[PDB]
Structures are given as structure tokens and as C-alpha cells.
Amino acid sequence: ASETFTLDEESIPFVPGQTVLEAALAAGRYIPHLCWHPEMGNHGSCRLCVVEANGRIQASCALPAQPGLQVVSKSETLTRVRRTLLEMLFAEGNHFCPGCEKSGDCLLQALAYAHGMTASHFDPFYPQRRIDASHPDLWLDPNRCILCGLCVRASLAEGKEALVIGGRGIASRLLATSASGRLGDTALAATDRAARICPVGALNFKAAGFTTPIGKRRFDHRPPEAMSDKERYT
Amino acid sequence: RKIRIATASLAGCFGCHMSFADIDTRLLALAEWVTFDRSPLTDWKTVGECDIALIEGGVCNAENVEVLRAYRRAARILVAVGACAINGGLPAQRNQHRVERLLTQVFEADRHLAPGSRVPNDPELPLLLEHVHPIHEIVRVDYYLPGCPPTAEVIWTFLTDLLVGREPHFPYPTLRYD
Amino acid sequence: QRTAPGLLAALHQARSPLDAQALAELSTAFSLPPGEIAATASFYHFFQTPPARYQIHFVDHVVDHHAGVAALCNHLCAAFAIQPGQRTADARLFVGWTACAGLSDQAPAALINGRPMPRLDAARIDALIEKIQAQIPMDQWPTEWFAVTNAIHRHGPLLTWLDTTPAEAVFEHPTAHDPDAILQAVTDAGLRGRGGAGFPTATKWRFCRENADPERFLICNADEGEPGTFKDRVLLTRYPEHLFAGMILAARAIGADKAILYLRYEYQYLLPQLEAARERIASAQATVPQAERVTLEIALGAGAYVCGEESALIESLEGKPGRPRVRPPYPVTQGYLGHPTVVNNVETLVAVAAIVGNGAAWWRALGTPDSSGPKLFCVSGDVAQPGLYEFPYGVALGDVVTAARPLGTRYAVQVSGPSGTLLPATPEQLARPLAFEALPCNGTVMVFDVRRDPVAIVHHFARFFAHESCGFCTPCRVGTQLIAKTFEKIAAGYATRFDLERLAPALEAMRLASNCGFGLSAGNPVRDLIAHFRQQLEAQLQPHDFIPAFSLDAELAATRRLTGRDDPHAHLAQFEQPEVT
Amino acid sequence: ANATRRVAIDPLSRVEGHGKVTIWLDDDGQVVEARLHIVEFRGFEAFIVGRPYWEAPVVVQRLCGICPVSHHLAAAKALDRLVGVTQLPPTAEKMRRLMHYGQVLQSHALHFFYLAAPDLLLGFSADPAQRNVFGLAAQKRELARQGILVRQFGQECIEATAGKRIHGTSAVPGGIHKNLSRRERMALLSRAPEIRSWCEAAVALIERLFTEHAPFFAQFGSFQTKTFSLVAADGSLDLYDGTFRVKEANGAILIDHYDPNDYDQLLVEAVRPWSYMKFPYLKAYGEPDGFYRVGPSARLINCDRLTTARAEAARQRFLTFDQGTVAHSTLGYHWARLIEMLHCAELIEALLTDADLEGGELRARGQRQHRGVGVIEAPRGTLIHHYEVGDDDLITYCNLIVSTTHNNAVMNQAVTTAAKAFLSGVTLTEALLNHIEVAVRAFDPCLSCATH
Ligand code: SF4
Ligand code: SF4
Ligand code: SF4
Ligand code: SF4
Ligand code: FCO
Ligand code: FES
Ligand SMILES: [Mg+2]
Ligand code: NI
């Protein structure tokens, strides 16, 4: 760690060229994020990581650390902009947490609690995508999927290439790369890194739900800031 | 003058009202400080006018709309309580299906029905809407209490706050959507 | 990493029914799993059209709507008992919509199996309705119907130089064969991007040349794309050979073996002429040793305005969905196939031909000190003479507008397509010069007289942004939709003050948090509507505190049908009535 | 038919859900017909289809916020069978019982103390502003404080076993996902005697009431209808598990120990155009002979026995009372109900001395099949869940017959009986209309449950 930059009036060490997000988290200084992940690196879709620098707002997962770069991660504007993004993602899908088997074990939800989100102030989109329960060990509710793309990246990296995001605009959805469009016809296996990496309730194991008592779930009274990287990340 | 509270259940399960009653003996202290208009707990058949309306449940049918509007006009502060009223809740999973196809599944096609069974027609019954909607899609909402249901501790904190004039604050440890 | 270079071409190829069989052929060809190919193909508008003998897209564009294209679509949809966006029982006809097809001057218009049909009247629709029932091949149709007019209503030194001097002549002179000299010529001219961006051309050429990688690419951006823009369409029809000269000159300047004209899907009619022209110009270099010479290719796009963003264009050409990259690295560093790449607009490269042709003094003689040179302007809308207008950069907005002859009294002008500004026609606004230092303009000017509703205009743009968003990032994917929905609510008469208050925080998030300049731009129309046409918008907000956005029946229609009721209690009112004491 | 004038109590107060009664008069001031319209419907049986099976105990319990535990366990029981498990391991069996016993305890106390006793203790005519739980809190405070605290202990039993007071998650296919800790068990056990002693007081109270008011309460009606419920093998009442028993009014066991799994050969549901609540009846008798009634008084009639002393002592007194009449009384349901509440306290008092609540035998697994039926006695009567599930693991079919649904006919009947008793002598008061709602309230109707 040769160089340093300023994150909220603090000298923060950095290996060039880590991004700001990478360097901050290495130093134990949390910044809201969703689509970033230690193994699969950045992506740039969620936008929760945004920060003020040069002298505009931009994603800290793409912002490269420079020596003596001046960075604000905590302001009223930044907390509002994030709150808003959290309302967009909730509005966009069917996040009925009360019957979701990732309630209390879900990053989107935990981020929402941490930004004191009370309700998404937008008209719901009530999308109408089909569940895919074709795989023997796995199932996919696509109305919960936030298009983080971790499942995709994970699968490219381990060679299975099972998934892909297709469509344009609000039609954008997660798709299986099989000719039939069915997860069961791809090479995806329950042992694959991709199988367990979804941070919300979209892609799940079959019949492994509601096994954890309320009170003892991954995020139960632990915001993302309070967690180690073991537990924070899928 | 004592404050007036109306309460209502639209496409709810009554669960938010039970979480309200989960304040336990504190309801005796609440009884001293407030007065209840229309509410499933009281006999008043017609709403209003009051300082606070607690609404649980989504809007699922025509009579929910007429009632929601009534409560809106009658009440200064209208509050969307529970997941149902907030984003449509688990009942809103029916927006995955065609409402005709549902009613027909339940009242005509079901293998355990008597021969001749038909979807109920009578004007005394209110028609279901095409989709379930949160209350905010129909009227303006002043506050949301999340949870399915909200904790009694939230419901209490919320009221406690409004009675004293203060602005509702929900600590992280009282917040849930599930 | 995931590049599939030829895939875009191949996907066109595989249309003269995209079945699971054809995906398997491409999957082998391209080493991509069949659904990845499907997914790429699903991103493009013109690849998702239901097959027919006659596919017809009507141009959903504000100027076409003003010329009553709405009505003329229904005069055909009615005549086949279908709705727009669906196809006939026999699979004979599909009728649907599409974004501006670069025919803003010749409205109203439509696309039909790729070929454009401008200036539609009911007599054309009636004569068309017959042509499809009698089942006649399109070539048999009067080719009068497909003629596109590239009307130039005001020449200057540039169009003059273009009309006068032939394309190949510039290769006689010695500059054309010295890369440094071309760079310098252009640097001295102070040329700036005519695609609207407006960065010094020479600067990007230099950054690209200063890179370690010897392998480099020039791409010419003829996905003109922005509604109301047709200047590229003129330059392609009128002076293709001059374009290819510029492509070659600039390719030489930056040391690029290859140079690719990326032509939008809508202009595919121009392909046979462009191939003719491309081949004629590649002779004027034949003298060069072939190892040494710049190769010229043309690539056909497939229906996306987001693909006028540099990195998305590149992604498209690498056989992937045209979604903007995460930059840096920028394309000048790592672009097409990971090699440094310059993307220049058509008008920019034509300027390059002129600048190597006439010298930098000749160029800098024209325009302002900051925005040097002549600019072309594609003017359209409520004007006696829509078409192309050369002015020096620096010209007052008014003069451009006036030179086309507003039909009604002036009201509002959209400068630089929907991405730029919507301005009222006050003298203080029309006084403003058209230059990067003042009022930036990529050449699109759209004039609206006083019959037009500012609100309804923004709504047309709101829908276009919603449709054309790449869907990659949260605030833009969702937020563009929130806007479109807010203007649906205004148009239907349900909108109130509260609806703009709930929309604000999403605009904020779009303007600040978007990943590319499309999500930043998309908030512009409603920002301008609030800032200038405040009152015209207040006039379409109901005085109620809130009103449902959907017809509350409607909603009961389904259950009315079933139960069989039409009594009052099976109907809901919208609205309510206040009352004060 | 010849009904000329219509009057409606709309909506029904101090009940859960959305119900309305219409009362059809004629020009003489006489009442031809009354009708219970259950006026809400969400369609859980149809929209749960497509979802994974393991969601059902958690989502389907959103039918109701008074007895989600009844649906939580019913779904669980059904999915046990699906996953090939009949007998649960001990720890799961005992947790599930505690959840249920607590559920019945609090639900009965919710009804009596919040919904029913405002009438029974402040009188059926009391000015509306007082005729509710707050008027009761003001007047009979120490009584209302007890009730609230009984309900609390029930819910706190559920919090411990399910994870929340309302809508838990612990009942799973095969068993339970947790046990009690020692501190939760002791904390509960320490409270349990006092709670039971207040339930005792509540029975003493409701008897004293009938002793004084019995002739008046008889005006609200009797039933000559059959009684339907779960008996255990022996065949005492067992609220968690058992097979069907039906007795005729005189009882007279018509059917006994009938496999819940075959409920579909036993039962059929009729639909009238004017309610979303269906009309279940015994197939082999058709209607209206095959109608029956369930709940508190059906159980106490049906069972041979209650397994706890104090409550069985009091059951004898309920059945003996001047002299049989009241067991088949409309308002009898209240006396039965408070007895079950005592019974549950007594169960719980005992169950929390069982160290298996801290055990490590939480869950069994067996042979997967495609169908599962789960039955339980919910507070308001017998509950049936039926699920069918693909190899997908997505539910392909759900059918629910819910407690209140069973009493559709008898509730309609009782509405009619009181309508005549109290409104034929016109003219109509608010206080006389309340008399009709009082008849409905005896059934502790759960209308969200009833319709689903
Ligand atoms: S996946 Fe997360 S945010 Fe989405 S509904 Fe489930 S728990 Fe809630
Ligand atoms: S399935 Fe999960 S990991 Fe994949 S795109 Fe959806 S949220 Fe991202
Ligand atoms: S939020 Fe949950 S508790 Fe409240 S009405 Fe909806 S289902 Fe019931
Ligand atoms: S802002 Fe986001 S969604 Fe919009 S086009 Fe750019 S990257 Fe895609
Ligand atoms: N009790 C109860 Fe709910 C009802 N009725 C169920 O089952
Ligand atoms: S983590 Fe930075 S944009 Fe999603
Ligand atoms: Mg049913
Ligand atoms: Ni219930």
C-alpha cells in the first residue's frame, strides 16, 4: 500500500490502481454497495456505491484511486440518492419479503433497513415473469432479481456460462443460456460458485428455506457495516 | 380535547390490528389519551372525522376503494400500516394471474364443489379489481409503518410520537418488512 | 473477453424466422451458447419484429405525430382488424412503431421491410392497403413512393467545396500521405466533434496515437440516432465518396489499418450506393501496397439510439448487447477488440476531407474563435422549408429558425434533439448563438409553432428515452419509466402537484447516479418544461391532492364481464369532491 | 320472496373480516329472511399455485392475523405427509403443541375480552361509544387487564416457538427449525400458573352470567344440526391432531375416526351467489341435511373427555346446565370457548415442564409423494389444508376448507332466528340491530379465514 487519498477527511492507504470502493473496504471503511463483490469485482448497475469527486457524483466501484483524491461518501445528498435507488429496486420487482425465503438473509433488504427505508414511494411495476424450477437442485424467481450480474460473472469465471442478462430497458431479465431457455438444460450445478452467489432471493437452492430462526439470520440486527467479509458476502 | 383515531382493514388479514393490540396493557393507557371512531373494534358503522386513520391491507375490490376514500376525507393524518397497505403484500401475488381465471378456479372448477357451482353474481358482493394495489396508488399517505405486521413496538412508538406532536422516528432495531 | 466480431452481420444474414435451429448454427460459429446469442439478438428493436411478408413500422416521432401519423396508422390497423404491434392471422402483415428513422424533414413516414416511405397521405395508405391484399412484391410498386429528398436549402463554402471538387482529388496533394501532416492540419483548424460531443478531434486522435498498441481502429458513427437529426443522411446520399476520403485520412492520421462505417439499420437503403462509393475510393489508394492501405468496411446496426454512445457502438460491433461499458478505460485506450479506437461522426470526417483539401486557414476563417468552422443544420418541424442548412458556427438561433420560415408564429424550439434543450421562442433565447461556448447544438433544430403543446412534446421524448434505455443501471432503467408514466398520467388528466413532487427524487438520481450520458440527458426535457413552460404544465395539473393513475374501471371490466353486472355498485368513480367550512 | 323492504347491518363490528347481514322485511314489519354476506375474497388457493411448496406454511398463514398459527401448522402437517413423515420426532411435536395451545389461548381471549364481552358485560343496548373494549377498560378495568394479559401470554408462547407473535416460520416439512432455550422455558413456566388462574375466573364469570341470563339468551336460538370435530384415538379432544368425528344433534355418533386424508370423499362445498364464503356439507347427506357446525361447543359436545382436570370439571357443568339446553345454544359458544381457554392454559402449564422442548430431535425426513393433507382444530373449528406438488417442487393445487367456512349455514340460521326474535316487533333501533350482531359474534367469525 504505497499511496493514499482522502475519504471523508481521512487518509486512506491504496494500492494503485484499486478503485476507491476497493481501497475503502480494505481499510475497514464501509460504503453502500450491492453489485460489487470481492471475487467477482465491480459491475456498476446498482449505483449504491456513488460518491462525490471531481467534483461530481460517480460510482466508487469504477472510480480509480489517485494520490490525494478528495472523496465524500457521507452527505445528505448521497443518503437521499441511495434511498431513492432502494425505492426503485423495490418498486421495480415483487419484494414481498413476508414470504421470501431470503428475508433477514438478503442484502437489498438489509441496505433498505440501514437507510431507514420505510416504504418505496413509487407505484409498483408488478412484473409478470415466470419462475424457473426446471433445475433439480435450484430455482429462480426472476421478479426478485436486481440484475447485479453476480450469478452471470460467477458462471463465466468457472466455465459453465449458464446465465446471461438479456433484453433492453425495463424488459431486461436474467436468462439461462440453454437453447430451451431452461436452467435445467444448462451446465449449472448446485456446486457451482454461481449457484450460491445471488445476494437477494432470486436464485436459490431448492428446499432449503426457512431453516434459520427469526433472530438468528445473517442480517438480523446487523447492518452490512457490522459484518465481516465472510458473512457480508455470498 | 382527546385525539381521535379511526382504523380500517381493506384487503388485510386483521394482523396489523392484532399487532396493534400487542401493545398489551399499554392499550389501557392509550384508552385514557384517545377516542376511537369507526374501527373493527368499535360499532360506529360510518367514519369520521378524526386526527389519524390507521389503514391495514391493500385495495382488492370496489368497497375497499369507497372506504379508503372515506377514511381519507375524514382523517387529517392517514397511515399505511403493514406490508399489504404499503406495496400490496402477499395478496398482490394474485397480480401474476387473471382475476377471472382465479374466481373461476375457486368457485366453478374446483373438484370439491357441488354440481352447478358458479362465481358469485349478487350486487351485494363487491367486484374484485383487475390487480391488487397499495393504498398510495389510490390516495395520499402521510406515513408508512412497515412489517407483516409491524412490531407492536413500532406501532407504539409511532403513536407515542404523534400524540406528543413529535415527528415519527423508527430506530433500525424496530424496522422490519417481514 | 466475450467478443464475437461478425455476429451483428450474421444476425441480419439469418433473416432472409430466427428459430432454435439457426441459433445452434451461430453458437458453433461463434463459440457462444445459444441463449447468449438469443439475448444479444433480443436487445435490438428490429430483431424482435414478428415475421411477415410486409413488416411496417410507423415513425413514432414528435414531428410525424404533428403531421398526423397517429391517424394514418389506425387507417391501416383498422383495415386489417389488428392493433399496432401485432401481426395478421395469415402472417401477411405486421404493423408497428419505431423511433425517428432520420426522416424528420419528410414527415409523416414509415419503414416497410427496411425501405423508407416518406410523406404519407390517406391516398398513399389506401393505395397501400390494396397493394398488400393483391399480394404484390414491393419492387413492382411505384418507386416514386420510396424516394427520399435530401433538400439543401442554403449552401456555404463547405457544401460548395463538396459539390465542386471531386472526392479523390485530395489524394493528389502531399498532406494526404503524411499522418503527422493530417493531424496537424486538423489541429490547426481547431476542428471539434460535429456529433454534439464537441471535443477537439485532433486531441482524441493524438491520445489514441500516443498509445503503445500499434493496432488501432477508426469507426465512423452513422448511427446518427437522435430524433430530428438527418444531416448525416444527406452527407451519405450526396457525398459518400468524401466521407470515405475522411475515413481514410483520419485512419491514416491515427495509424489504423481498418476503418468501419457503422450505419444505422434505418439507412440500409443507402447500402448499394455506399458500397459503390466505398469501392471507388479504395481505388484512389490502390497505389498503396495493400499491406499498408486502410481497409474500409461497412457494418449495419439493428435498432438502438443508445448505440450512438461510443462504447455501446463498440459493444454492438463486438457482437454483444449495446450497453455502455464501465469506463475507464475509455475506448481511445481500449475499444474495439481491446485495441485503441477513435469514434468520429460523419460530418466530422467530411470536415477532415475539406481541411486536408483547403487548409486550416480556410476552415478557421469561418465560425467563432471557440467553435471554428461551418456547421450543418437539419431543420424540421413547423417550417415552410425543412431540410439542411449550412451556417458558420456562431449563428444566432433565430437566424437558423428564420431561414426555414415558421408556419405559425414561433413558440418553442428543441435544440440538438431531445438530449439537448427545449427553449421558448423569446427574443432573448433566439438571440443566443449556436456554438459550444454558448448554446450547444449538434445541428438538429426542431421548430414548433403555437398549436403545439410543450407538455405533449416532452411526453413524446419521455417515451423515447423509456424505450431506448439500455436497462443496465438502476436510476435510468427504472427512472426513465417513472417519467414516461408521469406524463401518461398528465395526458389522461389524472396528474396533480403531488405527482411532480414524487418524481423529483428520481430525476435527481438519474442526473447524478446514472452510468452513462443517456441517463443524465433523459431528465432534460422535464427540467426544461419546469424551468420555461412552468405555466403550461400547471395548466394540466388537476386541483385535487391525488388521483389514481389508472382507470378504476377498466379495473372492474374483467369482473363486470364475468358476474354480468352493470349496476352503479359495479362501477367506480375517479376523483372526489373537497368542501370547506 | 314477498320481501318488500331491505335493512342492512353494514359492516359487521367486533368481528374479524368484512361481513354484512341483510334483513328482508315486509310491509307488516315482519321479517321473511336474513342473510350473511361475506363480502371479501383474495384467492389464496389459486395464487399460491406456482410457488414452491416450502413457502406455504409461511405465505398461506397470511389468511388471518388471529390464527396464522393454525394455518402455519396445518400447512406444515400437510407438507410433512408430502415429504413422507407422519409421526414427528418429540421435540417438533411438543414445540408445535405449545405454539398451538398458545394460539388457542390468545385467540379465545381476543374474542371474549375484546370483541364479545363488551356486549355481555356492558349489555346489549349500551350506547355504542362505550360498547367496545375501551368502554370496558374504563368500567371493568381489572377484568380487561387480565384478559389482555391472558392474550399476551399466549402470544408470548408463540413468539418463543415461532419467532414472531404473528406470522412465524419455525414449523417446517418434517418438524421444527428450533427449540426453546432454558430461559424462554422458565420465563414462560413461571407465568403460566397465574394465567391459568385468571382463565378459571373467566369461567366462573361466564357461568354466573348464564345462571342469571339463560332464559334471555335462549331467544337467540338452538341448533338441531350435526357437530363436527377432531377427536384423538381415545377419543378425547386433541386440538393439534386427530381424526374426524361427527355426532347428530342427540349424538349419536354418525361417523367416527374418519381419516382426514380422505376429507374429499366425505365433504363437498356449495356456492351461493351472495357470499364469497362457501357452504360445506357432508356429501352423503346432501343439503340441507348434510350441514354441520364446528368450533368450541362442537368440540366439547363431540369429545369423550378433556385431558385436563379443571376444564373437564367445567365441561360437565356446561353440558348439564338446565338441562342440556345451553350446549346447543347459539350463545353457548361463549361458555364452551372460555372452557377451551382454561383447558389450554392447563395444557401449557404442563407442557412447559417437558424438557423435550429443549430437545435435539427437531426433524424427520421420508419418502416424497405428490399430495398432503393437514388437519388441525383451529380456535374457531376444524381446519383442512390440501396441497399437490409437482416434481418441479411447485405447488400445482391448493384447497383450503377453513373453520368459519363450515358454520356458514348455522350462522345464517342463527342470524335469521334473532332477526325474528328481535325485529318483527318493529321499529328498528341501533340497539336492536346490535342484537343481530351479537348472535354472529358468538361464533367468533373469522371472515378472512372463511373466504381466503
Ligand atoms: S429478495 Fe430480498 S428484498 Fe426481495 S422480497 Fe425477498 S427479502 Fe425482500
Ligand atoms: S439472480 Fe441474483 S445474482 Fe443473478 S442477476 Fe438476479 S440478483 Fe443478480
Ligand atoms: S401486513 Fe401482514 S399482518 Fe398486516 S394485513 Fe398484511 S398480511 Fe396482515
Ligand atoms: S444510464 Fe444506465 S440504463 Fe441508461 S443507457 Fe446508460 S448505462 Fe444503460
Ligand atoms: N380460527 C380460525 Fe381461522 C378461522 N376461522 C382458521 O382456520
Ligand atoms: S457496487 Fe458500485 S455501482 Fe453497484
Ligand atoms: Mg376453500
Ligand atoms: Ni382466522
Report the 3 state secondary structure along C14-33.
CCCCCCHHHHHHHHHHHCCC
| CA A49 centroid distance within chain | 10
Q: Say yes or no: C119 and C167 in one domain.
A: no
Q: How far is the CA of D406 from the centre of ligand 5 (A)?
A: 10
Amino acid at C499: D
Segment holding B162, helix H or strand E: helix B152-163
Instruction: Name chain B contacts of D264, Cβ cutoff 8 Å.
Output: 111-112
Q: Say yes or no: C441 and C462 in one domain.
A: no
Instruction: Please work out, in degrees rounded to the nearest 5, the angle formed at the alpha carbon of residue D67 by the alpha carbons of D64 and D73.
Output: 110
Rounded to whole angstroms, how far apart are CA atoms C294 and C290? 8
Contact A188, A177 (CB under 8 A): no
Segment holding C398, helix H or strand E: helix C397-402
- Tell me the pairing of strands C410-415 and C444-449: antiparallel
DSSP structural state of residue C250: H
Rounded to whole angstroms, how far apart are CA atoms D162 and D167? 8
Q: Say yes or no: C328 and C198 in one domain.
A: yes
Instruction: Give the bridge partners for C353, in sequence order.
Output: none
Q: Say yes or no: C357 and C210 in one domain.
A: yes
**Which region, left, alpha or beta, applies to residue B125 given φ > 0 means left and ψ of -120 to 50 means alpha?**
beta
Probe target for ligand 1 pocket from A102, A111, A139, with the most ligand atoms within 8 Å of CB: A102
Is residue D398 part of an annotated ligand binding site? no
Contact D11, D19 (CB under 8 A): yes
Joined together, the cell numbers standing for residue C144 give 416514386
- The verdict on residue C152 lying in a domain is no
Is residue D452 part of an annotated ligand binding site? yes
Tell me if residue D101 falls in helix, strand or coil.
helix
Probe target for ligand 2 pocket from A92, A129, A200, A204, with the most ligand atoms within 8 Å of CB: A200
Q: Which residues are CB-neighbours of C495 under 8 A, at least 6 positions away? A: C486, C489, C540, C541, C542, C547
Amino acid at C565: R
Tell me if residue D435 falls in helix, strand or coil.
helix
- The verdict on residue C19 lying in a domain is no
Q: Say yes or no: C229 and C348 in one domain.
A: yes
> Which of B118, B124, B128, B130 is the best mutation test for D, with the most CBs of D within 10 A?
B124
Contact C39, A164 (CB under 8 A): yes
Rounded to whole angstroms, how far apart are CA atoms C478 and C470? 11
Q: How far is the CA of D278 from the centre of ligand 7 (A)?
A: 7
Contact D271 B60 (CB under 8 A): no
Long-range contacts of A120-123 (CB under 8 A, 24+ apart): A120/A86, A120/A87, A120/A88, A120/A90, A120/A91, A120/B87, A121/A87, A121/B136, A121/C502, A121/C505, A122/A87, A122/A88, A122/A91, A122/C482, A122/C502, A122/C506, A123/A91, A123/B136, A123/B137, A123/C485, A123/C549
Question: 418553442: which residue's cell?
Answer: C412
Range of the domain at C142: 54-146
Q: Say yes or no: C213 and C163 in one domain.
A: yes
Residue A64: CB atoms within 10 A of its CB come to 15
Q: What is the DSSP string of B54-120?
A: EEESBEEEHHHHHHHHHHHHHEEEEEEEHHHHHH-TGGGGGGGS-HHHHHHHHHTS-TTBPTT----
Continuous H helices in C165-309: 179-189, 201-209, 231-238, 240-254, 271-284
Number of structural domains (chain C) is 4
Measured from the Cα of A202, ligand 1's closest atom is 1
The chain B residue lying nearest A100, using CA atoms, is B178
Rounded to whole angstroms, how far apart are CA atoms D97 and D103? 9
C-beta of B86 in contact with ligand 3 (< 6 A): no
| CA C315 centroid distance within chain | 17
- CB-based contact (8 Å) between B101 and chain C? no
Rounded to whole angstroms, how far apart are CA atoms D327 and B166? 53
Contact B149 D110 (CB under 8 A): no
C-beta of B149 in contact with ligand 3 (< 6 A): yes
CA-proximal residue: ligand 2, atom 4 (nearest): A151
Closest by alpha carbon to D354, among D100, D92, D152, D164?
Answer: D92
Rounded to whole angstroms, how far apart are CA atoms C70 and C77? 11
Closest by alpha carbon to D292, among D340, D337, D345, D247?
Answer: D247
Q: What are phi and psi of D267, to 5 degrees?
A: -130, 155
Ligand 4 neighbours by CB, cut-off 6 Å: C 306, 323-324, 469-473, 476-477, 514-516, 518-519
Is residue D159 part of an annotated ligand binding site? no
Rounded to whole angstroms, how far apart are CA atoms B52 and D344? 37
Contact D409, D291 (CB under 8 A): yes
Where are chain A's structural domains? 1-234
| Final residue of a structural domain among C341, C365, C389 | C365
Rounded to whole angstroms, how far apart are CA atoms B89 and B67? 19
Instruction: Name chain A contacts of B93, Cβ cutoff 8 Å.
Output: 94, 96, 99
Instruction: Please work out, in degrees rounded to the nearest 5, the angle formed at the alpha carbon of residue D24 by the alpha carbons of D23 and D30.
Output: 105
Q: What is the DSSP string of D38-63?
A: E-----HHHHSTTSBGGGHHHHGGGG
Rounded to whole angstroms, how far apart are CA atoms D70 and C39? 46
Number of structural domains (chain B) is 1
Ligand number nearest CA of A111 is: 1
Q: Say yes or no: C296 and C409 in one domain.
A: no
Joined together, the cell numbers standing for residue A84 give 431513492
Residues 493-532 of C with CB under 8 A from B: 498
Residue B109: CB atoms within 10 A of its CB come to 12
Rounded to whole angstroms, how far apart are CA atoms C241 and C249? 12
Instruction: Name chain B contacts of A86, Cβ cutoff 8 Å.
Output: none
Rounded to whole angstroms, how far apart are CA atoms B47 and A161? 59
Q: Pick A210's closest partner by Cβ from D62, D164, D177.
A: D177
Q: What CATH number has the domain bearing residue C519? A: 1.20.1440.230
The chain B residue lying nearest A128, using CA atoms, is B96
Instruction: Please work out, in degrees rounded to the nearest 5, the angle formed at the alpha carbon of residue C412 by the alpha carbons of C411 and C413.
Output: 135
Segment holding D432, helix H or strand E: helix D430-442
Closest by alpha carbon to C114, among C12, C191, C238?
Answer: C12
Segment holding C3, helix H or strand E: none
| CA D389 centroid distance within chain | 28
Closest by alpha carbon to A41, among A153, A138, A134, A144?
Answer: A153
Instruction: Give the bridge partners for D5, in sequence order.
Output: D25
Instruction: Please work out, in degrees rounded to the nearest 5, the angle formed at the alpha carbon of residue D438 by the alpha carbons of D435 and D443.
Output: 150
Q: Say yes or no: C270 and C343 in one domain.
A: yes
Range of the domain at D417: 1-452
Q: What is the DSSP string of D120-159?
A: HHH-TTS-TTTSSHHHHHHHSHHHHHHHHHHHHHHHHHHH
Q: Which residues are CB-neighbours of C259 under 8 A, at least 6 positions away? A: C217, C218, C219, C220, C247, C248, C250, C251, C294, C295, C296, C297
Q: How many CB pairs under 8 A join A and B?
A: 69
Rounded to whole angstroms, how far apart are CA atoms B22 and C202? 73
- Tell me the pairing of strands A51-53 and A56-58: antiparallel
Rounded to whole angstroms, how far apart are CA atoms A37 and B173? 27
- The set of chains that have 3 or more CB pairs under 8 A with D is A, B
The chain D residue lying nearest B37, using CA atoms, is D129
Instruction: Give the bridge partners for D388, in sequence order.
Output: D371, D397
Contact B102, B94 (CB under 8 A): yes
Q: Say yes or no: C310 and C420 in one domain.
A: no
Q: How far is the CA of D451 from the centre of ligand 7 (A)?
A: 7
Contact C511, C490 (CB under 8 A): no
Instruction: Give the bridge partners for D126, in sequence order.
Output: none
Residues 2-31 of B with CB under 8 A from A: none
CA-proximal residue: ligand 1, atom 5 (nearest): A95
Closest by alpha carbon to B68, among B52, B55, B82, B49?
Answer: B55
Range of the domain at B54: 1-178
CA C409, C415, C419, C424 torsion: positive or negative?
negative
Contact C424, C533 (CB under 8 A): yes
C-beta of D9 in contact with ligand 5 (< 6 A): no
Question: 388537476: which residue's cell?
Answer: C542
Q: Say yes or no: C141 and C177 in one domain.
A: no
CA distances to C197, C400, C533 from C432, in Å: 19, 11, 18
Instruction: Name chain D contacts of A101, Cβ cutoff 8 Å.
Output: 54-55, 58
The coordinates were experimentally obtained by: X-ray
Instruction: Please work out, in degrees rounded to the nearest 5, the angle formed at the alpha carbon of residue D363 by the alpha carbons of D358 and D368.
Output: 170
Measured from the Cα of A98, ligand 3's closest atom is 2
- CB-based contact (8 Å) between D288 and chain B? no
Contact C455, C529 (CB under 8 A): yes
Instruction: Give the CB-side neighbour count of residue C376, counting CA atoms within 13 A.
Output: 28
Preceding peptide of C108 cis, ω within 30°? yes
Q: How many CB pairs under 8 A join B and C?
A: 58
Q: Say yes or no: C338 and C398 in one domain.
A: no
- The set of chains that have 3 or more CB pairs under 8 A with C is A, B
Q: Which residues are CB-neighbours of C393 under 8 A, at least 6 positions away? A: C366, C367, C368, C371, C372, C373, C374, C375, C434, C435
- The verdict on residue C572 lying in a domain is no
Helix then strand then coil, in percent of chain A rounded to 5, is 25, 15, 60
Instruction: Name chain A contacts of B88, Cβ cutoff 8 Å.
Output: 96, 124, 126
Q: How far is the CA of D61 from the centre of ligand 3 (A)?
A: 10
